[PDB]
Structure 1
Amino acid sequence: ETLNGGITDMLTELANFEKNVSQAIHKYNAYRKAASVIAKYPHKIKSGAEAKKLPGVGTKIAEKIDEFLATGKLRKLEKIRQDDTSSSINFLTRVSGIGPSAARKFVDEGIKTLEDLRKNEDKLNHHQRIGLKYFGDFEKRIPREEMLQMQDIVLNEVKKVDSEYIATVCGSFRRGAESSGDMDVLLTHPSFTSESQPKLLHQVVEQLQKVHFITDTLSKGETKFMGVCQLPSKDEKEYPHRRIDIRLIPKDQYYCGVLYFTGSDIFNKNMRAHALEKGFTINEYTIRPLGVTGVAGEPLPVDSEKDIFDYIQWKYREPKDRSE
C-alpha cells in the first residue's frame, strides 16, 4: 500500500520541481520512474543500497533515500519548499494551460497565486481562463457511477446525430476502474478512412453542446476535441465540471486507437515489446510486419481489438486485466 510512502512522496515532489521549475523533463521522468518501481516494491526499504537494485534507482536517489531514512527529510527539498519564487512557479503549473514557461513569466511579474490570476484575466489565454475557473473541479476524480451516466449521454447523443457512428469510452473507465481522471471518447464513422468531412467531429460536439452536456472548449480541430462537460443537476448539489476528450479516428485505424487509448501505459508497451519480438511493430495507428531487413511492411487490416492479438501470438485480454 503506502509501504514506502515517505520515499515515493519525496521523489514525486522532486519530480515536479524538475519539470515545473528546473524545466528538466527527463529528470522529471527519471524521478517518477524511480518512485513507480519503489511504489510496487513489497518491502519497507532499509537503505539506499537496497533500493538501488531496482531499475530506475541510481546513485543519487539511493543517496537521497539514505538521507531521508536518517533524518526524515531532504535538506534540498526543504529548502526549495520554502523558496517563494520556486514554490509559486511549481504551484501555478497546477492550472491547466499554465505550463513551466507561463508559470515562470507570471511569477516574474509578481503573479503568484490563484487570486493574482483572478485579477489578471487579460494576461490569460482562453485555455488558461478555463483552467483557472475549474481549478478545483479539474483536480477531482470521477466516480465510476458518474462516468456511466456520462457514457449514457454521449452514446445516446452520438447515435442521435448519426446511427452509423461508432463511439467507445476508453481509458481507465474501459479498464473497469472505480474512478477516472477524465473521459476519453474515441469516435469513428464508416465514411472516414486514411485515404478519405471536418463536420464528423463538429456535428457531434455541437449536439453535446445543444443538450448542455459540453460546457466549454479548450481546443477543437478537425480530428481532436478537448473540452469540459457536466452532468445535469439531479434540487441537488451540482456535479463538478469534468474534462472530456473526443477523438475522431479513421475506421481502419480505430481499433489500434481503442487498444492504445485503453492502456494502461505499462500494459501496452509490454504488448508492443512482445509484438516486435515477433516482427510486428505496434503504434497508435497501425500494426506492421518487419522484414528480415528491419524495414517495415505496409500496415495490416484491423477490424476488432482481438485482430491485433491474433496477428501477434496473444490471446485476447479483457480491458479489466490490463494494468500490466
Structure 2
Amino acid sequence: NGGIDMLTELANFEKNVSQAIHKYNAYRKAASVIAKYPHKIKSGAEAKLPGVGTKIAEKIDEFLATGKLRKLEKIRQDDTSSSINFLTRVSGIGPSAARKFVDEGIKTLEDLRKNEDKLNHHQRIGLKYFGDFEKRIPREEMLQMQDIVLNEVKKVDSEYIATVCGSFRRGAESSGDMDVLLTHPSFTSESTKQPKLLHQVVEQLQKVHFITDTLSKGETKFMGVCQLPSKNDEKEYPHRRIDIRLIPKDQYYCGVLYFTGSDIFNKNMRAHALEKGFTINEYTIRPLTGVAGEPLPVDSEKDIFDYIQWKYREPKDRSE
C-alpha cells in the first residue's frame, strides 16, 4: 500500500504548514497501521484498522479511484506551502522558522545560502550538509562506523559500552543516521562519580577526525556530524548525522528500548503503558491519581514488555 506516501505527505503538511501536531501524529499513525497491513487495500471501508477513521477512509477512496488526492494537488501547487515544506527539510529549521524565512522572502536553497548570517548554528550546519543528510547510509557503511565508534570508545576507557541502536539495531539494510547508546559504570541513577564522561568520547572521536561538527551537546546527549575516512583518490563519503546518548548504566534496558524505536513503536508502546497504568521513558518504567510512583525493577528489555502485558517483540519487529 505504498501509494496510500499520501498519508505521509498529509502528515508533513499538517506539521510544517498548519502547525497542527496532533493531525501530524494522526496521519502518521494511520500510515503506520496501513504499512503493516498484509493485504492490498481495496477500499476505504476496509481501511477504516485502528487510527483510520472516516476522513482518512474518504481520502483513501479518492486515491484508489483516481490515483491522486485533490487536497494534496492543491498543496503541491501552493507556493507558500511548498516553500515552507521545503525549508523544514534543513535540520534545525522547523515550521516556525520556515514560515518566518518564507515571510521574509527566503524561499529557496539559493536564498538560504545567501542569507547564512540569518541562521543559528544548528541551521547553518544543516544547510552546509543539506545534500549529504538526504542520503541514506548502507548497512555496510554503518558496520564500519560502528567499528570506529566502539574501538575509539574502548581507547578512552575500557569500561564504556557503546551500543548502536535505531534502525540499525532493528536490522535495517540502510539507516537515516547513526544512534549510539553509551554507558559507563561511573554514571548510574545513584551517582555520577566521573565528570566529562560524554565529553571525553566526543573529544576522542573529533581527535581522529570522525566527528566533524557539533549541532548540540550537553552532559548526556550529543547531536553532530561524522564522516568515514576514504582511501587515496577516492571520493569522500557523505557526511552523516550522529547522535550519542549517555544513559545511566542501571537504566540501560529502558534506554536501549527507547533508542531502538521506531519512534511510532515507542509512541504506541508508551500509549499502551498509560492504558495499563504505567509510564515509560528512556530511564524507567513507573506505575501510575496518575502520579508516577517509584521505578519498577528492570533486568531485561522483556521485563518492560512483561509489565504492560505485551509479548516480547525483537527489534526487527519494532519497525513501525
TM-score (ref. length: structure 2): 0.88
For the Cα contact (< 8 Å) 2:215–2:224, is it kept in 1? yes
Q: Structure 1: how far apart are the matches of 2:100 and 2:268?
A: 40
For the Cα contact (< 8 Å) 1:264–1:323, is it kept in 2? yes
Aligned partner (choices 170, 175, 178) of residue 180 of structure 1: 175
1:160-203 C-alpha deviation (Å, 9 max, x unpaired):
11111121111221222211111111112111122324411111
Q: Structure 2 vs 1, CA of residues 82 and 311 (structure 1 numbering), >3 Å: closer, same or farther?
A: closer
CA-atom RMSD, angstroms? 2.7
Q: Structure 2: how far apart are the matches of 1:148 and 1:187?
A: 17
For the Cα contact (< 8 Å) 1:252–1:301, is it kept in 2? no
1:273-309 C-alpha deviation (Å, 9 max, x unpaired):
787898765432113456xx97754324445546656
Q: Structure 2 vs 1, CA of residues 120 and 258 (structure 1 numbering), >3 Å: closer, same or farther?
A: same
Q: Structure 2 vs 1, CA of residues 62 and 304 (structure 1 numbering), >3 Å: closer, same or farther?
A: closer
Residue range with higher mean Cα deviation, 93-102 or 180-189: 180-189
Q: Structure 2 vs 1, CA of residues 192 and 59 (structure 1 numbering), >3 Å: closer, same or farther?
A: same
Shift of 1:144: 0.9
1:209-266 C-alpha deviation (Å, 9 max, x unpaired):
0000000000001111000000001221211111111111112212210122123445
The answer for the alignment partner of 2:277 in structure 1 is 279
Residue range with higher mean Cα deviation, 40-49 or 95-104: 40-49
Uncovered stretches (5+) of structure 2, i.e. residues with no partner: none
Shift of 1:74: 2.4
| 1:101-180 superposed matches below 5 A | 101-180=96-175
Q: Structure 2 vs 1, CA of residues 311 and 25 (structure 1 numbering), >3 Å: closer, same or farther?
A: closer
Q: Structure 1: how far apart are the matches of 2:302 and 2:65?
A: 51
Shift of 1:101: 0.6
Residue range with higher mean Cα deviation, 54-63 or 303-312: 303-312
Residue range with higher mean Cα deviation, 66-75 or 200-209: 66-75
Uncovered stretches (5+) of structure 1, i.e. residues with no partner: none
1:119-150 C-alpha deviation (Å, 9 max, x unpaired):
11100111111111111111111111111111
Residue range with higher mean Cα deviation, 66-75 or 296-305: 296-305
Larger Rg: 1
For the Cα contact (< 8 Å) 1:280–1:289, is it kept in 2? yes
Shift of 1:114: 0.6
Give 3-state SS (helix, strand or coil) of 1:193's partner: coil
Give 3-state SS (helix, strand or coil) of 2:49's partner: coil
- Structure with the greater relative contact order (CA < 8 A, sep ≥ 6): 1 or 2? 2
